[PDB]
Symmetry: none
Subunit: 71 residues, 6 copies
């Protein structure tokens, strides 16, 4: 008996904001007035941002193998 | 017996905002009044943003193999 | 018996903001007034940010193998 | 002017396994063999239980009122 | 002017397995063989149970009122 | 002007295993063999339990009021 299995194999994930080119992405003009306002619960305001954001809870990678010989 | 399987294979995910070109994506002009407002529950206002965002909970990759020889 | 398995195999993840080019991303102009406001619960305001952010709770990588010979 | 509103009102939820009577709920006979099994991913077996279970993510209760007099 | 509204009202939910009587619900006889099985993904086997279970994500209760007098 | 509002009102939740009677709930007979098993990922086996369980992530209760008089 000869038993010579070969694995020469590749497993990949990419999860991304990637290889991107941003050239001169200039911001605007933003003006906010706000008078006599009442808030009675959770607030998460955001103004004039220009952000780049990535989360990736995923992207996970898994491999399983098994070999048996019985005589 | 001559057991010689070969795996020469690629398994891939790309999950993304990727390979993009953005050239001079200039912002606008934004003006906001707000007077005498009441909010009685959760708020998430957002103004004048110009953002890039990616989430990717997915993109996961899984492989299983099994080899048996019995005599 | 001649048991000579070969693994020459690669398992990879990339979870990221990566390979990116940002050329001259100039900020805008932002103005915010605020008069006589009440907040009665949690707030997280954010103004004029210009951020790069990556979390990556994921990206985890896992491999299992097993070999048996029985006579 | 005589502004005399009356609220004499009840707002209720019951979310439950409740007011129940269980009289002599006797268990059975359970027998399990298990030989030479393989599991390659998550397992949650359960045997011979006789349980009482309640979750209740709900049942939440909300009231809003408002009174104005303007002259 | 004599503004005298009366609310004398009940708003209720019951969401349940409730007010039940269970008298002598005796279990049976259960026997399970299992030989040489393979599982390659998630499993949740369950044997000989005799359970009582309630979920209730709902059952939520909401009330809004508003009163105005203007002169 | 005579502004004399009355609230005499009740807001309640019950989220529960409650008011229940369990009389002589006797357990069964449970037997488990297990031979030559493999588990290659997370397990949570449970045997012969006889439980009472309640979670209640819910049951939250909220009230808001507001009064104005303007002259």
């Amino acid at each position: 008996i000869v038993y010579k299995p070969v694995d020469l194999s590749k497993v990949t994930s990419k999860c991304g904001s990637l290889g991107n080119i941003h050239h001169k992405p200039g911001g605007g003009q933003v003006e906010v007035k706000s008078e006599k306002l009442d808030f009675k619960d959770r607030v998460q305001s955001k103004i004039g941002s220009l952000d780049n954001i990535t989360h990736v809870p995923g992207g996970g990678n898994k491999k399983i193998e098994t070999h048996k010989l019985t005589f």
